[PDB]
Design a protein around this ligand. Sequence first.
Ligand SMILES: CS(=O)(=O)N1C[C@H](O)[C@H]2C[C@@H]1CC[C@H]2O
Ligand SMILES: CS(=O)(=O)N1C[C@H](O)[C@H]2C[C@@H]1CC[C@H]2O
Length: 284
Amino acid sequence: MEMEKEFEQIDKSGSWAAIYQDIRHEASDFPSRVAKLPKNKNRNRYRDVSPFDHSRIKLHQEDNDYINASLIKMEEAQRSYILTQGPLPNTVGHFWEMVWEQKSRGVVMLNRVMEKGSLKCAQYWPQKEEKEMIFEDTNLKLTLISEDIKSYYTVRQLELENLTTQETREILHFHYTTWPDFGVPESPASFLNFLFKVRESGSLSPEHGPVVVHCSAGIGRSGTFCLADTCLLLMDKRKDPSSVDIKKVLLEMRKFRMGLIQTADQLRFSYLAVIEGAKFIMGD
Ligand SMILES: CS(=O)(=O)N1C[C@H](O)[C@H]2C[C@@H]1CC[C@H]2O
Ligand SMILES: CS(=O)(=O)N1C[C@H](O)[C@H]2C[C@@H]1CC[C@H]2O
């Protein structure tokens, strides 16, 4: 079925939970043996969210190459994404090592450091220009260059230096700051505006390594971001945009990381975002 009228048909019939459970039942199951090794326990935030072995990002290190991060490669859309958990106190150096080694231009953050009165990820970037961060375990230096605070999101320019080689690179930090502590946003307008700002920066384009996108677990809000982006790109590429099937795209992405889209409300929100976004691109 088309999307916008499949949407109204699920609303009127109140069957979002059943649609979402079908996706959970059909989703891929692949091994994650490296994630579960005892030496990696303090490298995982949640015991039930792990990268698959076949798609995990490897650190360029011989001691321990493990990080909780997955490469999502979308062949028809010609886009790739790295989805990862929010960094832990003992993985902030690994996080920036991955950004460096994978040649990423942008980092997309969809959570606040504290939500619901608890810590959802480490403070992993510097908050003042004159107070830079040094990660001694991976030999990197990170400096805040500029910060632009807007009503729904903040963009930061960062400098990452590989202290072994003295090479430097400019990284863009795109921080969506207004996702509610509970539920999903009422309108997708600010989330779509944010997606378009990431696109306009070059951070999603083939002349760079994959964008790094995270929330707390790296599957829920993060899944919504890449699902919406890929569906909108496919609608632009194809002769028949109504042939894009958001459930099929989501199942394809779940071949590369488990659990993408965590609730039926997130699924409904993803439909809403793609529907509204397709009108602004031109459509209607
Ligand atoms: C009732 S439902 O399955 O269709 N469903 C939608 C409803 O709006 C509420 C509660 C439930 C699941 C998500 C949430 O959106
Ligand atoms: C058919 S589609 O547009 O919904 N779609 C094609 C796209 O390339 C992805 C995901 C999905 C089906 C498998 C794969 O080819």
